[PDB]
């Protein structure tokens, strides 16, 4: 599904970062880096979900996975 992260979206995100001009090869590297970040967070999240014996992953599991990885996120509780 990783080709579902469209080239326009990557362009918009880099524009929010202030990049004026973007090389044609950046897209596959950006997809790889996004995928390894997601995999790490999802692994920790599911580890909390399993220890709680829940079947639904909650927003608290994501908030805790992000905090343990060292990046505090406010707004979701």
């Amino acid at each position: 599904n990783i080709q579902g992260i469209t080239k326009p979206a990557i362009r918009r995100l880099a524009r929010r970062g202030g990049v004026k001009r973007i090389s044609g090869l950046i897209y596959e590297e950006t997809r790889g880096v996004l995928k390894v970040f997601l995999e790490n967070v999802i692994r920790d999240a599911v580890t909390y979900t399993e220890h709680a014996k829940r079947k639904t992953v909650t927003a608290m599991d994501v908030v805790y996975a992000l905090k343990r990885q060292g990046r505090t996120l406010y707004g979701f509780g």
Binding site: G4, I5, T6, R12, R16, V46, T56
Partner: protein, 89 residues
């Protein structure tokens, strides 16, 4: 000419920049390898998206300076690779 005005618009604006459905399918694809047939609460995907786009925005902000150090205008793959190396990722 337009890219600077685009930069202003997207920095002034506050919407999410990745379409929802593809990101949601990607998340459910990834999760399957760790446990089968999970469910995701509606806000869990929003929390994941709000993390990942901000992470990339920060990575691109660092990449921009990594490009300017070479006296380049354009960012290239090895700029991202340097950024991650010095960041210790």
């Amino acid at each position: 000419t337009v890219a600077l005005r685009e930069i202003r618009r997207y920095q002034k604006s506050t919407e999410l920049l990745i379409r929802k459905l593809p990101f949601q399918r990607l998340v459910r694809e990834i999760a399957q390898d760790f446990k089968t047939d999970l469910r995701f609460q509606s806000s869990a995907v929003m929390a994941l998206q709000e993390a990942c786009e901000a992470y990339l925005v920060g990575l691109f902000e660092d990449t921009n300076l990594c490009a300017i150090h070479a006296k380049r205008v354009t960012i290239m793959p090895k700029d991202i690779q340097l950024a991650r190396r010095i960041r210790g990722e």
